[PDB]
């Protein structure tokens, strides 16, 4: 009569193999051809990619590994690559019932028309299966009923057809008791203006109950230059606290008033992340920070930061479904979060996100080893 015990989560979007959505420019660059040198950039990362996030498929595989049950909603073709992906997910035990297969479209491929009329112009003739799903039948109402969290990323807002479907799905979940999680993960086209982006993402933000944004994303949305100027303020004559006497990295806590431009009534929680180093949380009644660490140099020749963001979002979802007092008690939330930081640390120690996403036992052991007994 009731549903199975660990509550279910739904991940909606496109299944892509190892795709990093966020791209901006970096001042430091290495040799064009020798790839044995590129590891150095992983050791000292460009900031936007301290904990790179990824495709919606990856979050599901991690949730299952950390304990938990997940389902993936999307369309893949009946081609060979498509079948490989479903096999991987099925093998990892992610529910694949809501995946639709199409015979007229091919996975990973988009047809474009390149036209030069004094400018390089590309226009889209046909779209990828992943980016073409429809409300009508692609939506399994059964999965939507059991689910207690719906997870989407911002890529869906870059295609007209999936945008329409996302909104039908959000509505149906709320009817059946669901809570929506928007993990932003901004794509390259959406890093051009604060103004164009705020408008494109607006409807989604307001229909969201839990939101995760990176430090670089939050500043992009609000006063990016103002924050940059602040971090380069060095006092002229005397320091005002003994902290400024010590030359250490900035970890500013954004005051609740600053984030007011972006709050809405149905927002239970907001998380801002700075790699695995800091995680800031904001709630209708309380605010704060959880301290963390990162050691990619313990294994210098097998370090990749590619799925670390997916892992932090997964640990959060796992603890939130199981522990319900996180929403109202500050201490519980903090203690619980330290588990998510741990998942991220372990995901930076292997090449490839799917290889090396951590298991629950391993994550508890690292929490216990890294933190003092009282904190844990």
């Amino acid at each position: 009569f009731p549903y199975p015990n660990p509550p279910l989560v739904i991940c909606f979007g496109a299944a892509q193999k190892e795709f990093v959505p966020t791209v901006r420019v970096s001042h430091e660059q290495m040799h064009q051809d020798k790839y044995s040198e590129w590891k150095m950039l992983q050791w000292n990362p460009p900031e936007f990619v301290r904990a790179p996030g990824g495709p919606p498929s990856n979050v599901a595989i991690s949730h299952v590994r950390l304990g938990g049950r997940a389902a993936f909603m999307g369309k893949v073709g009946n081609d060979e690559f498509g079948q490989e992906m479903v096999l991987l997910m099925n093998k990892e035990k992610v529910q694949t019932r809501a995946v639709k297969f199409d015979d007229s479209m091919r996975t990973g491929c988009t047809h474009m028309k390149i036209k030069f009329e004094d400018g390089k112009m590309k226009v889209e003739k046909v779209k990828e299966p992943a980016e073409d799903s429809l409300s009508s039948s692609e939506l399994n109402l059964d999965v939507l009923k059991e689910a207690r969290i719906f997870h989407f990323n911002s890529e869906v807002l870059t295609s007209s057809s999936m945008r329409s479907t996302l909104f039908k799905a959000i509505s149906l979940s709320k009817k059946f008791g669901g809570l929506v999680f928007f993990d932003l993960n901004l794509p390259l086209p959406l890093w051009r203006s604060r103004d164009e982006t705020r408008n494109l993402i607006k409807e989604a933000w307001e229909q969201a109950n839990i939101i995760e944004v990176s430090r670089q994303e939050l500043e992009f949305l609000l006063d990016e230059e103002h924050y940059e100027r602040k971090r380069n303020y060095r006092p002229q004559y005397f320091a005002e606290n003994f902290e400024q006497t010590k030359q250490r990295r900035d970890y500013y806590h954004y005051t609740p008033a600053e984030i007011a431009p972006l709050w809405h009534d149905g927002l239970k929680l907001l998380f801002v992340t700075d790699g695995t180093l800091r995680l800031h949380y904001y709630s209708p009644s309380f605010d704060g920070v959880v301290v963390g660490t990162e050691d990619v140099l313990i294994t210098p020749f097998t370090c990749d930061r590619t799925g670390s963001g997916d892992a932090v979002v997964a640990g959060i979802m796992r603890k939130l479904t199981t522990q319900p007092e996180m929403y109202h008690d500050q201490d519980v939330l903090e203690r619980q979060l330290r588990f998510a930081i741990a998942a991220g640390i372990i995901s930076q120690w292997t090449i490839g996100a799917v290889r090396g996403f951590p298991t629950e036992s391993a994550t508890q052991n690292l929490k216990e080893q890294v933190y003092v007994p009282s904190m844990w």
Partner: peptide
């Protein structure tokens, strides 16, 4: 052993039965 690679998710089955088998 193609059967080994066919999973129940693909053969449409009603929910109550699916949840039970997976249990």
């Amino acid at each position: 052993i193609a059967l080994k690679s066919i999973f129940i998710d693909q053969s449409e089955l009603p929910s109550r039965i699916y949840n039970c088998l997976k249990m």
